[PDB]
């Protein structure tokens, strides 16, 4: 605590990665815990450089999309502070363990791609990197809250905290755990 | 009497400018006129951004031209006679000079 930042109130201790596969691309607490998610603007100039930056920051980055929200990273952080707050009142946990489950449960195990034969569509099943899983899982759940709040009275904060619950405990009421299983259902067929 | 006399230089060529300033600072300090150094002012950009094609046709292209002026001024305080004597002579290049009666 006096030598390692919390989050402004939320411990990064008592936080685990419960896979051996997806750690070393999920990290949040080795020393990478900080008061806020922000950077000086170094995040990528090498392929390995992407991995290092926190998961909580990565979530904030992929939250601002679709034209009108680009370049408004401070507005974005407002939504994240409410998210953890709502998650803690609503279920009562270290609200980061919610998010870590939500990411790990939403990442695909097998994926398909295209292959050109006879000028006609054929598909091939292939595997997926841990770095791919994390990138995909962060994409998918953020699309859910963006979609729901497009005509609902509910705010995006409320929508997003709901979306991490249904991902963290699979229940197929989320946009993520649905879309995960769609890909794998294809990957079984053409293989 | 001893009047604060300002020798303004103005040019477009950094070599031609600077060496003529140096000459006047040597000749002044040689005679102990209590000369004050150059005050280099911000170099100003004339920009002209215009078509490269007369009678526009083909891929749209332009051309940046620029002129850089330079100003700098040395402040002396000494009798106006010996200044106006020595100043106007010993200038080789096309570089302008403007003498002022007083400013301070």
């Amino acid at each position: 605590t006096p030598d390692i930042k919390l989050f402004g109130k939320w411990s990064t201790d008592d936080v685990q990665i419960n896979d051996i596969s997806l750690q070393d691309y999920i990290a949040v607490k080795e020393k990478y815990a900080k008061y806020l998610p922000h950077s000086a603007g170094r995040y990528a100039a090498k392929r390995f450089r992407k991995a290092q930056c926190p998961i909580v920051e990565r979530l904030t980055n992929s939250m601002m999309m679709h034209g009108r929200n680009n370049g408004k990273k401070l507005m974005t952080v407002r939504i994240v502070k409410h998210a953890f707050e709502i998650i803690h009142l609503l279920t009562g946990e270290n609200p980061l363990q919610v998010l870590v489950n939500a990411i790990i449960n939403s990442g695909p195990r097998e994926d398909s791609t295209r292959i050109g034969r006879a000028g006609t569509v054929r598909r091939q099943a292939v595997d997926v990197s841990p770095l791919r899983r994390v990138n995909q899982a962060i994409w998918l759940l953020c699309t859910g809250a963006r979609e729901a709040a497009f005509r609902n009275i509910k705010t995006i904060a409320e929508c997003l905290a709901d979306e991490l619950i249904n991902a963290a405990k699979g229940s197929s009421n989320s946009y993520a755990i649905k879309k995960k299983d769609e890909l794998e259902r294809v990957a079984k067929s053409n293989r | 009497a001893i009047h604060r006399i300002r020798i303004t230089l103005t040019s477009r060529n950094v070599k031609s400018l600077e060496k003529v300033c140096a000459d006047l600072i040597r000749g002044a300090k040689e005679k102990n006129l209590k000369v004050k150094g150059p005050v280099r002012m911000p170099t100003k950009t004339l920009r002209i951004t215009t078509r490269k094609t007369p009678c526009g046709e083909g891929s749209k292209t332009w051309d940046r031209f620029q002129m850089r002026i330079h100003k700098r001024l040395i402040d002396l305080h000494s009798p106006s006679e010996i200044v106006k004597q020595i100043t106007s002579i010993s200038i080789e290049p096309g570089v302008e000079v403007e003498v002022t009666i007083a400013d301070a």
């Binding site: - | 103005t10 100003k44 004339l46 002026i69 106007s88």
Partner: protein, 227 residues
Amino acid sequence: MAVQISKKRKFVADGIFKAELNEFLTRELAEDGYSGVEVRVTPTRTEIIILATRTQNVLGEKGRRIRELTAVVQKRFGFPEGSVELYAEKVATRGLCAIAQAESLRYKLLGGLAVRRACYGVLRFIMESGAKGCEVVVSGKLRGQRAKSMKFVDGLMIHSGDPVNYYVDTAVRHVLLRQGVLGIKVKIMLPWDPSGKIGPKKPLPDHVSIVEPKDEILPTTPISEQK
């Protein structure tokens, strides 16, 4: 007699005077081997150094022509009377003076002479006078009513980078005939690298060479030599 215009506008108006004159003169001194000017304002006096190769034809008998030229400028730009003072100058080394070489080729051609032998004759002169190399173009008609181009080239040339501003000069002159117009262009490369005037800078242009002196001797053996 005042005040005085902005410093920004001060340079523009000087440029307009430098340029207008330089095309005024070229339409009168073309036959006298014009090669440029160099203006200088001096204390309470204007100097206009009218560079041409043959000062003879510029001067005239009793200095008539120089008197015409001074009276023109005294009225045209509205100069204060008697401030204007002309001077002439002869240039030495005439084959580095592309402007004059091009405009001489013009009157050789317009005099009525073949193109190939004329281009060769001007070429070896500008090569002989000193020059790394040189080039001539003639674009326009000849031997029918479709156009062609005729390049005559010898020596070195450059085309790229910042050295183009220093180490070459280039001129363009239109010449008329009874059938259309012919374009002359002359491009000539300056040779100085050892020293002087100094005019163009001492390093080599396109491949920038390493100037290399040599010394290397030893005969040393131990001894003490008192001084």
